[PDB]
Design an enzyme around this catalytic site. Structure first.
Site, PDB file in Angstrom:
ATOM      1  N   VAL A  39      10.694 116.413  22.811  1.00 12.70           N
ATOM      2  CA  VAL A  39       9.963 117.559  22.284  1.00 12.70           C
ATOM      3  C   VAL A  39       8.635 117.161  21.646  1.00 12.70           C
ATOM      4  CG1 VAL A  39      12.000 118.946  21.884  1.00 12.70           C
ATOM      5  CG2 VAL A  39      11.241 117.322  20.151  1.00 12.70           C
ATOM      6  N   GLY A  42       4.051 110.866  19.477  1.00 14.69           N
ATOM      7  CA  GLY A  42       2.934 110.487  18.645  1.00 14.69           C
ATOM      8  C   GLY A  42       2.762 108.995  18.795  1.00 14.69           C
ATOM      9  N   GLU A  46       8.451 108.932  18.609  1.00  9.08           N
ATOM     10  CA  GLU A  46       8.758 109.841  19.701  1.00  9.08           C
ATOM     11  C   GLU A  46       9.833 110.737  19.130  1.00  9.08           C
ATOM     12  OE1 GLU A  46       9.161 106.310  22.294  1.00  9.08           O
ATOM     13  OE2 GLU A  46       9.012 107.790  23.918  1.00  9.08           O
ATOM     14  N   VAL A  47       9.769 112.021  19.454  1.00 10.08           N
ATOM     15  CA  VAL A  47      10.752 112.956  18.939  1.00 10.08           C
ATOM     16  C   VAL A  47      11.531 113.652  20.047  1.00 10.08           C
ATOM     17  CG1 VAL A  47      11.136 114.930  17.465  1.00 10.08           C
ATOM     18  CG2 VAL A  47       9.293 113.319  16.950  1.00 10.08           C
ATOM     19  N   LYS A  62      14.027 111.213  15.754  1.00 12.15           N
ATOM     20  CA  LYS A  62      12.661 110.704  15.686  1.00 12.15           C
ATOM     21  C   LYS A  62      12.732 109.189  15.761  1.00 12.15           C
ATOM     22  CE  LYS A  62       8.716 110.549  12.404  1.00 12.15           C
ATOM     23  NZ  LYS A  62       8.363 110.979  11.014  1.00 12.15           N
ATOM     24  N   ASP A 150      -0.830 114.333   5.105  1.00 15.63           N
ATOM     25  CA  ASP A 150      -1.044 114.596   6.522  1.00 15.63           C
ATOM     26  C   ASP A 150      -0.623 116.027   6.860  1.00 15.63           C
ATOM     27  OD1 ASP A 150      -1.894 114.010   9.106  1.00 15.63           O
ATOM     28  OD2 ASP A 150       0.006 113.093   9.706  1.00 15.63           O
TER      29      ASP A 150
END
Ligand code: MNY
Length: 327
Positions: A39, A42, A46-47, A62, A150
């Site tokens: 889904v 980054g 990775e998610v 994650k 962030d």
């Protein structure tokens, strides 16, 4: 410079609360969770939407990319410290990936819809509602001595069907300690506050309030990102072209900051551009005087002048959201 609120949170708490380096992780079993479908992706993880094969419960996995041990203990420590707070993603387990051995964080599942697809459909009230939910998370983490650093749409998961919001990715978050000088290379370029762009390193929770303002400005004006610089220097230029250089001068003089020759030239001199000048036929349904007043109190050069998350939640802009809760 020091935070105007929650400045002593970590001073009053035990060393183990904020000493993330001393953290010794208690690992779970990787085989408990299985990747269902990717889904997110980054450069730091990775998610995957996943499933707990012990009970068919959905979850988010994650998988972090190899990075310094210290950085990951920091994220885990902050996640553990914040777990339970309103609208903050809840860390359920920590396991080592089958092949790379990198830590994998297991989280509560959230049925998010990318903001590029979701935001266009949000109504005037929807924006007030979701921003209010996001503020709950920010005031909470700040009250617990933590700066997210962030804040941006990409790190705000929203299940529009359930009207549920979660503030995610605490990988850049840090503990606030009065007087500490922090790295300015945090947050994403478009959401970086003036302090990060002029090198004022003793910043605080207020940095998140600027990022929130950028996010909010993009939402009500349907201009994303709102401040679209091509690099860090240009980012300040883009901000100066809206807020004006007069306000920047006062700010720099107050903190005795002097921009290097190149940046000063790039910034030039600009008169302030009234927020209403951004209203057009595409965003008129979202731009209201209360929205502008709220935005105006968030996007201030001086971090000490910005609304605190607690103050922001009480702004009349959210009065119906509060009334709906109080009933
Ligand atoms: N890092 C996370 C922590 C907890 C979560 N619940 C999630 C995430 C995501 O990254 C995430 C994503 O990139 C894309 C779609 C999603 O639905 C999630 C998500 O739901």
């Amino acid at each position: 410079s020091k935070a105007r609120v929650y400045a002593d949170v970590n001073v009053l708490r035990p060393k183990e609360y904020w000493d993330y380096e001393a953290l010794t992780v208690q690992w779970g079993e990787q085989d408990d969770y299985e990747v269902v479908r990717k889904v997110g992706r980054g450069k730091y993880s990775e998610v995957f939407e996943g499933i707990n094969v012990n009970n068919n419960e959905k979850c988010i996995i994650k998988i972090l990319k190899p990075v310094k041990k210290k950085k990951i203990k920091r994220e885990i420590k902050i996640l553990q410290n914040l777990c339970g707070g309103p609208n903050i993603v809840k860390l359920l387990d920590i396991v080592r990936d089958q092949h790379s051995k990198t830590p994998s964080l297991i989280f509560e599942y959230v049925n998010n819809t990318d903001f590029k697809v979701l935001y266009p459909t949000l109504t005037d009230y929807d924006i007030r509602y979701y921003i209010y939910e996001l503020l709950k998370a920010l005031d909470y983490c700040h009250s617990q001595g933590i700066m997210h650093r962030d804040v941006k749409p990409h790190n705000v998961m929203i299940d529009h069907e359930l009207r549920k919001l979660r503030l995610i990715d605490w990988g850049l978050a840090e503990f606030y300690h009065p007087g500490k000088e922090y790295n300015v290379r945090v947050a994403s370029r478009y959401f970086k506050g003036p302090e990060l762009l002029v090198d004022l390193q003793d910043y605080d929770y207020s940095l998140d309030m600027w990022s929130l303002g950028c996010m909010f400005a993009g939402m009500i004006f349907r201009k994303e990102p709102f401040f679209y610089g091509h690099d860090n220097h240009d980012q300040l230029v883009k901000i100066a072209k809206v807020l004006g250089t007069d306000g920047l001068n006062v700010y720099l003089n107050k903190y005795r900051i002097e921009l290097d020759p190149q940046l000063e030239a790039l910034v030039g001199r600009h008169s302030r551009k009234p927020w209403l000048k951004f209203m057009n036929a595409d965003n008129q349904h979202l731009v209201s005087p209360e929205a502008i007043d709220f935005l105006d109190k968030l996007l201030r050069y001086d971090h000490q002048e910005r609304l605190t998350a607690l103050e922001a939640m009480t702004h009349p802009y959210f009065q119906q959201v509060r009334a709906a809760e109080n009933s």
